[PDB]
Amino acid sequence: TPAGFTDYKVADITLAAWGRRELIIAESEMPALMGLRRKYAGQQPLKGAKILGCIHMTIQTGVLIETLVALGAEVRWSSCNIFSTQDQAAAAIAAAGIPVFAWKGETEEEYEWCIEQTILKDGQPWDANMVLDDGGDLTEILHKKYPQMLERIHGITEETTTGVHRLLDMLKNGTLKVPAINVNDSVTKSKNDNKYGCRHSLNDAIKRGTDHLLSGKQALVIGYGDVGKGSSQSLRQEGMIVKVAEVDPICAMQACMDGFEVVSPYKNGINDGTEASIDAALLGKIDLIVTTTGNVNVCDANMLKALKKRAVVCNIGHFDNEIDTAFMRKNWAWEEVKPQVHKIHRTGKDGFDAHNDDYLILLAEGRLVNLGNATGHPSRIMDGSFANQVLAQIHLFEQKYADLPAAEKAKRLSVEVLPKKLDEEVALEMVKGFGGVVTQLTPKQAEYIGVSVEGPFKPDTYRY
Amino acid sequence: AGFTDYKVADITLAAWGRRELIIAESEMPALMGLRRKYAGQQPLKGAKILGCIHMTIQTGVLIETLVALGAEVRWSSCNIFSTQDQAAAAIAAAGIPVFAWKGETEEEYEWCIEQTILKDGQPWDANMVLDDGGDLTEILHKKYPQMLERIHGITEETTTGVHRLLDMLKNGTLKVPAINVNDSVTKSKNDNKYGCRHSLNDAIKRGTDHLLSGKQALVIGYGDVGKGSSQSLRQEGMIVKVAEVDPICAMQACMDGFEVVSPYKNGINDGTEASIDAALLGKIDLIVTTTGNVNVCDANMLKALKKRAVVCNIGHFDNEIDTAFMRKNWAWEEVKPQVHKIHRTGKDGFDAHNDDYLILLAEGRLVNLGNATGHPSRIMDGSFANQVLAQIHLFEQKYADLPAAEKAKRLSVEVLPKKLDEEVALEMVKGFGGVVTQLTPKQAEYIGVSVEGPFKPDTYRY
Amino acid sequence: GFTDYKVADITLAAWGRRELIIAESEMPALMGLRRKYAGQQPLKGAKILGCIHMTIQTGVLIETLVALGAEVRWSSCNIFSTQDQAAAAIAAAGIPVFAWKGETEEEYEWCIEQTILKDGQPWDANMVLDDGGDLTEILHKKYPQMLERIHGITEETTTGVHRLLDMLKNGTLKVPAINVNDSVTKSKNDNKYGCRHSLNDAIKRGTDHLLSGKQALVIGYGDVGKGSSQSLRQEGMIVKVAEVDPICAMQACMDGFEVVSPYKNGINDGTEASIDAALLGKIDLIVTTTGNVNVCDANMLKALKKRAVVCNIGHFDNEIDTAFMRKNWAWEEVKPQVHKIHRTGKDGFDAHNDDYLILLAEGRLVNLGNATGHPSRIMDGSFANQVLAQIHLFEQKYADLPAAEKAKRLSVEVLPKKLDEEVALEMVKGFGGVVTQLTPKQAEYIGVSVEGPFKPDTYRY
Amino acid sequence: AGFTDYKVADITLAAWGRRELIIAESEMPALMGLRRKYAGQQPLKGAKILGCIHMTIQTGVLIETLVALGAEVRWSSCNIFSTQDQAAAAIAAAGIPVFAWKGETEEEYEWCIEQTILKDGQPWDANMVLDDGGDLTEILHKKYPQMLERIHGITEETTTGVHRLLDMLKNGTLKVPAINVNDSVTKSKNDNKYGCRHSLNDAIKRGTDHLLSGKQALVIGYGDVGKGSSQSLRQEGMIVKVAEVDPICAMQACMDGFEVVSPYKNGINDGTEASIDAALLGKIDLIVTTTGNVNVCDANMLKALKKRAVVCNIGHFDNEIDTAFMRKNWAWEEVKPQVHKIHRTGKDGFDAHNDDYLILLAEGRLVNLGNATGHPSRIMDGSFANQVLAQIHLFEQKYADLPAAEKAKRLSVEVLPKKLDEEVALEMVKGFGGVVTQLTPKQAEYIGVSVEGPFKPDTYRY
């Protein structure tokens, strides 16, 4: 009896049985992912693939991990957020002999150490050759601290909008060292996960964090991209009176037409940095503000100062700097209600009255509230995102960028999206998971609209 | 005084039409902002526009915006049933040639387009085309190629019109460049979707006055029009099922809370009655086609529909339903204009109290324009501000005057730049009293955009 | 050689008949009563004065009464609510009807009198069917003698019920009545769901305004206000709700509406200072639904956003201070039942004046004024009750009974819940719904009969 | 600290419970307004209240309101799974006898009620009863008639409890008057409907994390609870069908845009598998019982449900689902607390990867309280304001002190006056920032009401 399998760090390995029970259910909610697991078990298309994975260690990610593993891959995994892991999921994965370094409630130190444990196997760089990322933190660390490892990696498959944006910055600046597939912009990812996932999981997380009635109350959603669209619907369908802020007038136009009043935190929309710019009458009526932008400081200090007493503040974008929580740590006393729920007392820094009425309620300390305060998106939604993740991993691994002459590396050095035909094939398995029946074009019909009977049914410019 | 160059139902409707145009102007801030911004420059001075789009009150404000910016125009409707006669009469009384009335025959429809093309029996000195559906575009290519030599461009309104332009382009038959106005977000995701949300249940109420809540609807298609049409019915309380051939669109319908079904067992349309899901169709109270495709509500479907179901089409062309089969096999009883009971008992005559009929709206033509007034002004504001910008752009490019070599480089179908799309959107938002936030310089840097936009890459789907 | 009618255009009859035949397929409860009671002829000998909106739906009610044996003489209960093809179709069937769309106030009162009189002198009516009590009022206040041979009244709507109860409490009510409104298959089915269907319907026909994204103020949140609010919200309007009833305001909140008052702090003190001018200057659409008086008052009308739409879906047109508007501001007809009210003055207006309001149906019932009111499948519920109520009062034969033994009969009563359920069951079947049948053990467990009624009369649904 | 008259799961949870109570107080303006209105008057001084209701944070605020008004209480939960342990712990820590934890056995549940009834082995000097579901009321009548002699009244929270009260009255077995708290509109239409709207999908998400959008639900019942439950699922995008025995309620579901179906062919429950609509049941992903009835999701429906469907009950008692059949016949795999997979492959063990199972939430117990936290504070504010008023009213009536002749005249089940209902409503509305309009004198005269209310007759249904 030796030490045994120890290449992992989780909160509690004994939760594994529970995580496995939840993985087994989740499999039945993920027909596109499990169809790939079935269709590709033979080809072992990921045999020899050695995947650095950095994405929220949820049950849904566990079904993704095991699908890569079932297709031949070796993986070393960490979560991409300190609060997003489900400890029973992490424990279930570690119990299956898979290296995972993830728990709910990491410090920032532990977060970076966890990523480090995927990168280093046994004190030396693992011979990684694939990267799966969500937000780009693992991507950044590899480029800035382990560039030599990038010499052996065939590509990066990036999950989310913020991560894609960081990739494009690096592509533009000549600093991206390996090609990448933008998974986010599949329609079965962006207009499934980003919108409908937040529709499901935002009011989920707010109810779990606060158990606040939402009906009848006033919400301000900052942003009306895919996340903001889904977020606004999560709140409006519960009966909130939802107001939407935007910098993109096309997105603002959509919110008006979807039945929202479009407002700005600042008078005439001009954020001059002074308190006098804040629409105090507006913020003084808001019971809930949700940031969804991917931007920085969209719920700033002066807004926080002016919010209605006891309003709930949260962020469902990727990074916590959407809210100026730094200002609130410096100036206001924090009272933990329960994990990932704090009352922030605007009375001052040092201590608070337990019955002070002048406080805000912050969820997940500003981190992604759906994963921090609930369980993120549901399996049937994540099915689409992770089916794309698997297809993209298969494809970049087969391309073998790491094995090519230097000058064709410039030709392969690109951020690409999966082809629409693949997008549609994932869509079809999703629809069938609902019991939906897709109609087949007749040849005359296909000829009439200029498509093949088998698709793709839309040009790449089609917006859906 | 002395203006006679027009054909409308009743010129005495002009004072009424004018009252409604003055109202609609207040509902169209982007179109009216363009009028104010460009009146001094006269960017369309010398433009001579053949226009073929639904002669509604909203098209009136478009027409008069083009004119106010310097253009002369000759106008026809792009559907036999979509004209509002008071709008046509107001435009005629303003001295603008228009050939349009509600309830044209097909022959009269073709004649009206020809009256825009010919002036005093001769080709008009047109140099710009504004089209909706491509009917005018097609006539110019097939019958008046010499006129296209002097035409600088086509600004095409609708998905079906764009598809026909692209077919010409791939075939080398497109003679002048086009702007695809449909693909602006302030057109496609405003007009196509939200316009149909507003005007679909509108037309069905005017046509039948049927309660929709609690009743079963089948929407064929879940593109932009299908999405908005589904919402039109679901927000009224219908139980809406959606059919699609595009699994991505089907997936959206699922996620939007709709059951996705096919008219055919396992979705396999093999032309046989036996393929029809008769249990499904025998429960449907309302079928709506939204596809731009052919025969998506076919004869066997029509045979299987529940008795007294409503049948309608909000796509551009009436061949979405097999109305030919119904004319050939079944007796038509007019309820009122644009509303027919179609008795499945036979062709010759019908029992006035027969229970086995369907209710066809607008004879299968676009139901929102045929049985109501189409999209509202505040929505058409976006589409038609795009039209004006597109006319301004193609006219100023002066393709017809370019040397053959330069024409060849410019013969394409293009969309308006995102910056303009955004500028139209902003005026619309301002028309709701919305307040767009300005990025600080730091945030624009953070997300990699200018403070003034555009805010999204062209790949962004919204 | 039938001449005992007055309609706009009798040549519309064939059109009206086509819509009647369609409506019949949309009214299974009414048509069910036709087949159920055709044999019995329960209204044989009934002579019914009827005063209710002369729509296609009312036509099906009329011809249901006749199919069951009744003779009727009919008029509308609003000057703008008649559908002229419905009136014409009824007249063409040899049924006396006096109604057109767009009557004057004078002609409305003349049409009622023509039902009351037959061949120059009072009809020998023995039944009354009323929608707002105007006909009832005229029989009590001007024909207190015809009332002696009538076996009852059946009042259709909330307002008219209220007017009967003020007579009851004051002991001035003279024949027994049946409140048809308090049936759930009438009250909810109609007052709420009917306005859900027909309010935005009317606003679109009248204005063709996009509603999505715009600001509405619904005054009132009773059944009409509830259905009105949903009609606008389901279109994407941002709807605010005003109420004096905190319980209805509570429901508006819970339904996801912001509850506001036109007056600062809700205190309507008659001054221009009390008006929340900031709120009113943002409102694109105000809809009154209260049955009360002056809930959209002159000061609110002054403060409304330019080009706002103003309408009333309550029974009477004093909900809005239209009188102030006639006295002070110039009216421009856009088209029938649509007027631009110019706040620049009374002495004419500039055609391009931007400071105007849009008033629908001159403040009258907007859904019947600018569209066709409620749909057949909804009116089915109310009129099936009306038929049952007429049957019950006719067969009870009040006018043929001892003097004040009839005091045990003098009452405003509702219909038995079992009847309410029977109507509801026919309506559900019209949707193809399938009602589940309790097992004996189940019915014992909750203490009801397998046959119903399933709720006590206190249940609020 | 000397105080030991309680039993909770973990007393160290008290500080957490207290933090959540302080927050809930800010969400319960009506309850906290009663506290401020009556604190000086101490209208419950001398009241000794047996309370049996879900020992949540919201009930914690109610308990402390009663105490603040002068009452002493002894408390138990009315369901084995509904206690929030941190709420129980905070109440115990304040020196208030409470016997409640999440996860009780049935025997523990009974013991907890008895610990409120008995103090130091003898009947407590109880003189008021606050009940939710009738269980404490039942035990008092069956087992402690001597105590009822001294009790002035029962304030019953929920529909099922009121029914048992009415049966006892009808039978002559009710020993003390009761106030039906459920029947206030600020209870029935606030709590029963909008509460289950909030908390049903809440519980289902916490329990299963299943996507609901796009999936098929069958809700049994369309009363207040069923109305709220149907809305809870539809607003998430479920395709919701509704079953009912009451045709009026089914009519409401139709008009609300739901398809109305029966588990049984033509609605006829004949007791055999042959009478099951297996085609319908084979499509349902989620069934919710809302009836207060027995066996409304019976063994033959459970056999017929689509594989892996979720089964749950939001009615007061767990016999709405034939969970007893499932225990006799099928294998239960606990996923996590209050979530069980129920394997239809047999009674003895299961394949860990069997696909033919159902998901039962809270073992058939009220799912909103069992798998989440029940209704939110701002909703329970209305219910519990009514409780406090009902307790005040009966305690001051002092029925137990009246002569036998006066008792006979007051032995009834009453509801609170509408005026009070409105006063609770006004406080709830103010908590939303709502501004109620005050009638003018002439307006109040016009509709025949006082300016202060009541505004509706008692027959008004809202």
Ligand SMILES: NC(=O)c1ccc[n+]([C@@H]2O[C@H](COP(=O)([O-])OP(=O)(O)OC[C@H]3O[C@@H](n4cnc5c(N)ncnc54)[C@H](O)[C@@H]3O)[C@@H](O)[C@H]2O)c1
């Ligand atoms: N929590 C989740 O589960 C989840 C899921 C997907 C994506 N995300 C993250 O959410 C963020 C947004 O993702 P997306 O796909 O919606 O991106 P997006 O680009 O589609 O939307 C962002 C929107 O925010 C608007 N915006 C930016 N700055 C603003 C400001 N100052 N005020 C108001 N609006 C402003 C932009 O105009 C844009 O429309 C990204 O960080 C993404 O990674 C989170």
Ligand SMILES: NC(=O)c1ccc[n+]([C@@H]2O[C@H](COP(=O)([O-])OP(=O)(O)OC[C@H]3O[C@@H](n4cnc5c(N)ncnc54)[C@H](O)[C@@H]3O)[C@@H](O)[C@H]2O)c1
């Ligand atoms: N009536 C109006 O006011 C109005 C407004 C805009 C566009 N249109 C017209 O409506 C039509 C649709 O326009 P769009 O913008 O929605 O186009 P779209 O391409 O966005 O949507 C059409 C959809 O139909 C689906 N479809 C095709 N064949 C089908 C079949 N046999 N069964 C089921 N689904 C099928 C396609 O997959 C596609 O998603 C076009 O003719 C367009 O010109 C009408």
Ligand SMILES: NC(=O)c1ccc[n+]([C@@H]2O[C@H](COP(=O)([O-])OP(=O)(O)OC[C@H]3O[C@@H](n4cnc5c(N)ncnc54)[C@H](O)[C@@H]3O)[C@@H](O)[C@H]2O)c1
């Ligand atoms: N147009 C239609 O088709 C139709 C149908 C049914 C009834 N009605 C009429 O509509 C009106 C309302 O009917 P209902 O059934 O809704 O009655 P209701 O009593 O159910 O509701 C009216 C509401 O108005 C509120 N109210 C009164 N004065 C107010 C004020 N000053 N400010 C705000 N709210 C105020 C009351 O509190 C009440 O809740 C009546 O005149 C009725 O006859 C019209």
Ligand SMILES: NC(=O)c1ccc[n+]([C@@H]2O[C@H](COP(=O)([O-])OP(=O)(O)OC[C@H]3O[C@@H](n4cnc5c(N)ncnc54)[C@H](O)[C@@H]3O)[C@@H](O)[C@H]2O)c1
């Ligand atoms: N979980 C909660 O938080 C909560 C809240 C309030 C009440 N409740 C409980 O929920 C139950 C329902 O309460 P309610 O206020 O809605 O009562 P309700 O009387 O308003 O409605 C119950 C409905 O069930 C219907 N029904 C009965 N048997 C049926 C069957 N076999 N099939 C279909 N429908 C059937 C009835 O017709 C009725 O409309 C009661 O037990 C009540 O105590 C629970």
Ligand SMILES: Nc1ncnc2[nH]cnc12
């Ligand atoms: N009202 C309208 N006018 C012109 N074109 C349209 N297309 C759709 N609705 C229209």
Ligand SMILES: Nc1ncnc2[nH]cnc12
């Ligand atoms: N269509 C209609 N017919 C008769 N009375 C009505 N009241 C409301 N709508 C009506």
Ligand SMILES: [K+]
């Ligand atoms: K229009």
Ligand SMILES: [K+]
């Ligand atoms: K009607």
Ligand SMILES: [K+]
């Ligand atoms: K709670």
